[PDB]
Design a protein around this ligand. Structure first.
Ligand SMILES: CCCCCc1cc(O)c2c(c1)OC(C)(C)[C@@H]1CCC(C)=C[C@@H]21
Ligand SMILES: CCCCCc1cc(O)c2c(c1)OC(C)(C)[C@@H]1CCC(C)=C[C@@H]21
Ligand SMILES: CCCCCc1cc(O)c2c(c1)OC(C)(C)[C@@H]1CCC(C)=C[C@@H]21
Ligand SMILES: CCCCCc1cc(O)c2c(c1)OC(C)(C)[C@@H]1CCC(C)=C[C@@H]21
Ligand SMILES: CCCCCc1cc(O)c2c(c1)OC(C)(C)[C@@H]1CCC(C)=C[C@@H]21
Ligand SMILES: *[C@@H]1O[C@H](CO)[C@@H](O)[C@H](O)[C@H]1NC(C)=O
Ligand SMILES: *[C@@H]1O[C@H](CO)[C@@H](O)[C@H](O)[C@H]1NC(C)=O
Ligand SMILES: *[C@@H]1O[C@H](CO)[C@@H](O)[C@H](O)[C@H]1NC(C)=O
Ligand SMILES: *[C@@H]1O[C@H](CO)[C@@H](O)[C@H](O)[C@H]1NC(C)=O
Ligand SMILES: *[C@@H]1O[C@H](CO)[C@@H](O)[C@H](O)[C@H]1NC(C)=O
Lengths: 357, 357, 357, 357, 357
């Protein structure tokens, strides 16, 4: 048998196959199973609020026509340039940006057809998809990003979309993300869409992402704690009558606030307060208090000098006050810092532990 | 009855349907009702002066032709690939940038046809639209952004555009903006367009936006007020003969002006003065006055030392002057700041309250 | 009469109308009048050297064919999808970047035809056009930007382009630019183009733009004058034996030069010197002179101390010298600044006044 | 013989050549040899994780049809506009971004055909290809970048891809990269792909790149070592009772940490620690220790002054302690730096030497 | 005679003109002369390594067919929409980026045909072309940029490309570049290309560019020399026992190195050292030496004070040493700077003078 005669007899002009009519017309809705393969997950960002993904869409449906049963083989791998003479279903994504097809040398398309009429359609597409992430806890967080597949032009009475029981979502081997860790859970549920025109089918897929804490610690947690260390026992040791001691303190306050301004650069503008903001505010409070304490001891020493110019006994009293304040501080401040850090770290670890459940 | 015979008999070559002629030719103008659904409002910006929106346009009109009345059903959901054989009306937006169609797998289009001849056309399009915002009050403001739909090629005698009485503008459930809050008012009015060629129909839709005050306070209001706090009682306490006191003051003036330069980065260049500029200018005036007062007390002390090298009585007079000036300042400055902030905040709250009405 | 018969009889296959031949072949050149409407002027920039404009091109010409005279009406508004079966003239812009057409829902096109044969063609196009601006005077300047319309493929013997006597250039009502003020002059002249292939017709339109002085004053003129004020009477008052006085002066010199570097950011690199550069250089000269004068008084005081360790009479002489220098400076410097500013401002106002004529 | 008759008789409508059927149908798989020529390697970057390449793909296969043997010549150079009437194989790249064809004036295509049936297909294409580089050692590293060629729609039973034994990968003469040095090794191996649909052929090509150390030394290694030099013997020489000495040290710590923040700008965010981070951390440790030592000597001197206000013998003891500490440091610090640099440089040279093997 | 009959009789279906066969088939190669007109040279940059140019390509060749000799005129200006029915030659550029055609209203194309068969083809195209510039001497340099035209699909036996003897390269009148000066030399030579497939013709055009020295002097040469001036006689005059003198020097070193980092921003990363780097390194060496000298005099003064607490004679010796060192320096440093600048400037002027030849 010649191949040409079968290919034009099956789906051509001599056949009564109209490509504008759905299979099982005036009948039960056409069921469609959808299988997705993830080739390369990438380009997650915060300011734009979207990520990039390159998928391999695969959808199967049945046709009562296109049942040959004359060749002795089971399936046929047809050419992909005659995909315009069959009934492809419509499918779009609600959060759709970009989405251009890949057509290098030959169109990246695939067609298969079985003896009973089961078809197999495979398309390669790169999707820019919008994820509305919530940055309540900025350094430690889990983000859920949504993919939606739905029918633009048909109602529920036609083209019901179903998931696949086995291997619904697959990932390419050895795929890694520099910033996030993907979780192997991939919970699947479907939510219908209601409009004034009608009610339309939809299916949804969810991915869970965990941010890596490694980078953030080195850029922000360690240098801020260094600036704090540079104030803990660097000027308290120094002599009370020093211009430089106040200079040291002012410069430390200045550069740490400049770092605090530096931290909020990539982040999109939001009303609510992030965890990193809390940490920077507390560190700024300690370094500002350092100058405060200096002002206090300088004012007490000024009274001592003013009366100095019974007086010796009062002079002794005033210097003794100075010594008590400085030593008391030199041991008072470390513990409050310690109590803070332990409280902050334990509360953030337990809130992620509760949220993940 | 076969479907193919009806579809080509109705709108094909055997039918006298010319797709280049308007319905009701040499007759009353074709009325068109327009319904819009907002899928995703996003990407509002100031420098470029425009925003991004993804809509679901829907327009209905009547045709005296395309009245079948032979099938027993009421409406028909046709294929969307034969939308080139009917009379679509022309429609464009005056503030048009971008506006490319979404064609993933299948064109996102919809066609319906009733027994009398009422059609239903639905198109998905992403629009970049120019909004000429007025930044008279930068942190607290309400912005009105305009959408215009008008006919490029037909005059008033044809294609009059009407709004829909019920559900003219709809919004997707759970839609939020990070920076702005959308108001559920959506006032609709239509303004005709006059040209030398002729007079053309148009309809307009208005959206009201409220900016969130939360982010701006933390980035700018609180640190500037911190710098001010760092000058209020940090160097006044310190001893009069100090090089560091003037160093402290100079550095505070320097970094606050650098912050003032930093604030105007995203903003487009404008001639008029914003509210945030007023606040930064007043804060700069206070910190500059701090140095002023230092220069004054230093000059008085220099006269005291110069004569010091009746003289004691004049020496006492000069130091007494020094003490009066410093203490007087230490209580004089807080109130003026307080009177300022209360005046500024109450006037901006009442101007927004008057403007919103 | 049916519409279909007239539309295909007039400009179809039964008609001997070849769309590849110009009207009045082997005859006098086809005259063309061009009318332009400006919808939205925007995006003027300096670094890229170009601006963006959205126009409504309109061109009219006569045809000896396409003269019907059988319907009783005067003109006909035809469909815009059959603009490929007539003789459109070629037209391009010499400074052409971008220039893509707007095709939302339906192509933005317009066709009209009169009884004698006068046609009317209207096209909406967004143009990126290159303007070679001269920044000899940067804050105060007038810029002339050029639009050129010319024929690529025909010589002078065909397609002569003419302007329209009345309403040649129109602007949309209530159109404003944030940075520039447009002038209602719009002088029109035409310059022919000569090439080795032949001589080709062209027409030119000129727009005059005035930059707003409001923004530039607040960002640059006022803070630099503030830094200068911060040196005029802040350290001269202070005691001669002060480390801080020189610190004050050095910091002021440093930050003003950093501001001078900051000013030249948007500007494209150019060999010649702008006015703003002159102002910044003069301010830098004053603040550098401030330190100079300090070095002088410190050296004189050092000689006084060195001999101090007849001597009293010489000691008195040296301190008297110190006082003369400082007081003389305290009144000498203001006038030279005043003479400068009055000279600079009057010369720039009179040069713009002479240039505008 | 006329050329037209041969060209349409060979591959036209009178010929039974169907372009939708593979050669040797129901037969052994079609073998394909692939030869690549690299025109211009460029645009390697780290943040985006991809590079740009412009290649000349060349693939040869045999056909049992298209064997003429009637003209007396061996090969024919056909027109490249009739490449749609033959059986091109499908080919795509797994890491595919961009990949648009070059079509200036005429499509950049090439066709040749021999007497036996061997064809020659040449295509010019610019590829954006993703390379997942590992930055374990940032300044000194070797990066391997992967190119993959595979069949989208055919299984192993058809279209097996083979490399070419001679001249598989060629490079244009005099091709250089500003940042990297290409290695003339180009190891070639092939890895098959397994999917649920089937098993598909693939071939892989690897390129080795060496980063140049010249630029990194001048921007980062030399200035940091300068800051370190500016602390080694600049303040140790200075008098113990100096405010400036601590000022010097604080400023050096501040600017070096600002440089450390500056270094990580181009780099993508990663959890693991790079070599440059180790070097900057160690330098920061030395400059922080400098202030530490100052605090120590100041505290010892304060005890000396406090008791100073047997006492002389204890006063001598305390100053002697001061001298021992300072001189000991002045010779103690250089060696540890020397031991460090020699250890760091030798370990990085030997790890690259081991890795390259 | 009707025009339609001649246009379809000459190059249509009744004519035996096959557009897929080269003229003079099985004959001597088709000679082609190429003339280029430069409309607008622009956008030269360093980081990307490429420039932008808008040209008017013009190529002439002869055909033995298309010789009419029946109309009485010499040449014909045909329509440019029938350029698909003739034998255009293939032509591409080796360093090809972008290269999209300009199609505003009508395609920018031109066709002419003479009586003997000489055709004239004109195309407007904007080219992004890669220039591999060598930055050995960054502020003063001459750059040569290459344009290559070559045949993709034909060997030497066909389509030999020749230049035009008169007016090969033309430039539009009044064309200027902001940064570079174009030289009116334009040397033309041709280099053949050898490949494994065959040997292919090519022709090359070279442009010489001179960078303007005006901008670079004001941004970098003058302020660095200012910082140097701010160290020459500002602190040497000041008293030896001053904390501020060392503060002055440290700040000058700091800001100049920050400027040195600032200078290398636009520049692409390169291993070799530019001239500007040499100048900045030498200036940094002088300002670092300034602090060095301070450390020296402070150490000598410390010995003087230590012994001070025969001794007077040694005290005199030590102060005399101090005076000798300072005065000697005050006259020693200017000359070495002078010798440097004269050496550097004369060597760079003579190397450009030798290179240009
Ligand atoms: C008697 C007064 C001694 C001076 C003093 C000053 C001072 O600022 C603090 C003191 C004690 O105690 C501790 C408990 C460390 C406080 C915890 C953190 C905050 C912000 C302030 C701390
Ligand atoms: C007797 C003179 C005392 C020194 C003095 C200095 C001074 O700068 C001010 C003083 C009083 O009073 C108040 C009312 C606080 C003024 C309000 C705000 C401005 C800018 C200046 C303030
Ligand atoms: C006797 C010498 C007094 C010290 C002195 C120093 C000095 O720098 C200047 C003096 C006078 O006079 C005036 C006229 C203000 C000059 C005008 C502007 C320039 C740059 C220098 C000014
Ligand atoms: C007796 C104590 C003398 C003071 C002293 C201080 C000091 O910080 C160091 C000293 C010695 O010895 C050497 C070996 C140089 C250490 C190596 C590097 C590190 C970070 C610390 C160094
Ligand atoms: C006796 C020693 C006097 C102190 C001294 C210090 C000094 O750093 C230099 C001195 C002389 O002489 C000259 C010739 C100016 C040198 C030329 C440039 C370099 C970098 C160093 C200069
Ligand atoms: C699709 O599945 C539903 C539920 O199993 C079924 O009722 C319906 O008949 C199916 N459609 C077919 C078989 O066309
Ligand atoms: C459209 O509406 C107007 C106003 O109601 C009416 O006058 C006109 O006849 C309508 N057009 C029709 C029915 O075609
Ligand atoms: C166009 O105008 C010129 C000048 O008025 C005239 O000489 C020429 O005949 C006109 N062309 C026509 C009428 O076709
Ligand atoms: C391709 O090569 C394989 C291995 O050499 C061989 O078995 C097969 O027959 C070849 N295919 C042909 C000749 O079509
Ligand atoms: C092209 O020029 C060469 C050299 O002048 C000549 O040999 C060849 O015959 C020419 N080709 C023609 C005339 O077709």
């Amino acid at each position: 048998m010649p191949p040409s005669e079968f290919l034009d007899k099956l789906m051509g002009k001599v056949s009564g196959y109209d490509a504008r009519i759905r299979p099982n017309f005036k009948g039960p809705p056409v069921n469609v199973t959808c299988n997705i393969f993830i080739n390369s997950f990438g380009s997650i960002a915060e300011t734009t609020m979207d990520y990039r993904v390159n998928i391999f869409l695969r959808q199967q449906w049945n046709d009562p026509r296109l049942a040959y049963s004359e060749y002795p083989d089971d399936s046929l791998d047809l050419d992909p340039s005659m995909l315009d003479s069959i009934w492809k279903p419509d499918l779009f994504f609600a959060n759709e940006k970009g989405a251009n097809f890949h057509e290098v040398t030959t169109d990246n398309k695939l067609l298969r057809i079985s003896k009973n009429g089961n078809v197999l359609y495979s398309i390669r597409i790169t999707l820019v998809l919008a994820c509305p992430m919530d940055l309540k806890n900025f350094p430690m967080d889990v983000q859920t990003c949504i993919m939606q597949l739905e029918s633009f032009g048909y109602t529920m009475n036609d083209l019901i979309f179903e998931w696949d029981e086995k291997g619904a979502v697959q990932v390419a081997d050895g795929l890694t993300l520099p910033q996030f860790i993907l979780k192997e859970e991939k919970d699947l549920r479907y939510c219908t869409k209601h409009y004034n025109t009608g009610k339309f089918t939809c299916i949804e897929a969810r991915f869970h992402l965990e941010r890596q804490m490694g980078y953030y610690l080195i850029q922000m947690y360690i240098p801020s704690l260094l600036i704090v260390i540079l104030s803990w026992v660097s000027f308290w040791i120094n002599m009370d009558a020093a211009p430089a001691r106040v200079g040291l303190g002012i410069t430390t306050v200045l550069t740490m606030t400049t770092q605090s301004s530096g931290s909020r650069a990539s982040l999109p503008k939001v009303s609510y307060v992030k965890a990193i903001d809390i940490w920077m505010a507390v560190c700024l409070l300690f370094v500002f208090s350092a100058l405060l304490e200096y002002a206090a001891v300088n004012f007490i020493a000024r009274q001592h000098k003013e009366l100095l110019r019974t007086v010796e006994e009062m002079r002794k009293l005033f210097i003794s006050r100075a010594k008590r304040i400085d030593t008391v501080s030199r041991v008072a401040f470390p513990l409050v810092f310690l109590i803070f850090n332990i409280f902050y770290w334990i509360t953030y670890k337990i809130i992620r532990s509760e949220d993940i459940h």
